[PDB]
Design a protein around this nucleic acid. Structure first.
Ligand SMILES: [Mg+2]
Ligand SMILES: [Mg+2]
Lengths: 82, 76, 75, 80
DNA sequence: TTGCAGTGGGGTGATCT
DNA sequence: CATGAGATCACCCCACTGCAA
DNA sequence: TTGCAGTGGGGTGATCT
DNA sequence: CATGAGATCACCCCACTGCAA
């Protein structure tokens, strides 16, 4: 590659670099405000951060409840002379 | 007010902007791989995307399960 | 035993290699010190140059001491 | 370079390597025992080491002497 | 009402891998 | 990161030399 | 009088640069 | 070590948009 060639190649490289990021921001955008909405990059990332924590918290609550529900039906089976 | 004076000023505005995004990718990073690691931006995003989807399905599945378990409780 | 003889001599050859290598390490400690990392030939190149350097420095000093003593005597 | 070529090359590189050391051990030999004498590698280096130390010690001795001679000459006039 | 901050696209150079 | 290659080192094997039993 | 350690040459793979 | 080259990042400059004064 000559200087101009490196440049031109690098620009195509950098184009691929940008999509590697911008394409994932769109993916995150669709996950947090949906495919139809329009939202700016930092806002999408801000929503993605809080959505993840929300989902993480929910997951914990959902699990705590699943165990309780399971412990409940299990106990329902116990007929033992009390 | 010179063009260059104006380019320089906006340059400071653009760094603000760039950091509005970068600071946030670092936040996502700390959530997916933690603080000690080093992971490029696109990989932080890829992980965050997959983590969200993973949690989304994990949560939906627990919800489905919890429904039955709850109804089982009823039908008992 | 061709082999056993080899193994045994191999130990002899290591002792030998070490007889040269440990000296290069000493020469190295002398010319660039202990913390440095320097390859064998540079250690030797330096040693050679260092000796030549001190040789000339000491000659010059001896001829000058000569002249100084002559002066003192011739006074 | 194929393994075969790399091999052949390496042997010539290693020939150059050895010479870069051996050629110097003989430069040292000549300094410690002379052009004509023959002494083995480790004894040449042992001699080089001790010779350097001696050259170092001598230089210090010589400098001190040089100063004393110089301080001598001075007084040899500086007598007020 | 419109001129700047904000926002984003694309290019470059330095540096990394 | 990859390839490419010369450099550096330890160690291999071989040859031989000379001294200590 | 001679085998065995010592010495040195060159090759080679592993690794560094 | 030396290319070589893609990837990564920050910053550049440019264009445009929307809102605060
Ligand atoms: Mg960016
Ligand atoms: Mg050697």
């Amino acid at each position: 590659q000559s200087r101009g060639e490196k440049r031109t190649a690098h620009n195509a490289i950098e184009k691929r670099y940008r999509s590697s990021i911008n394409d994932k921001i769109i993916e995150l955008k669709d996950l947090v405000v949906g495919t139809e909405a329009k939202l700016n990059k930092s806002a999408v990332l801000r929503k993605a951060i809080d959505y993840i924590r929300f989902l993480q918290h929910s997951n914990q609550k959902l699990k705590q409840e699943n165990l309780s529900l399971r412990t409940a039906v299990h106990k329902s089976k116990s007929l033992k002379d009390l």
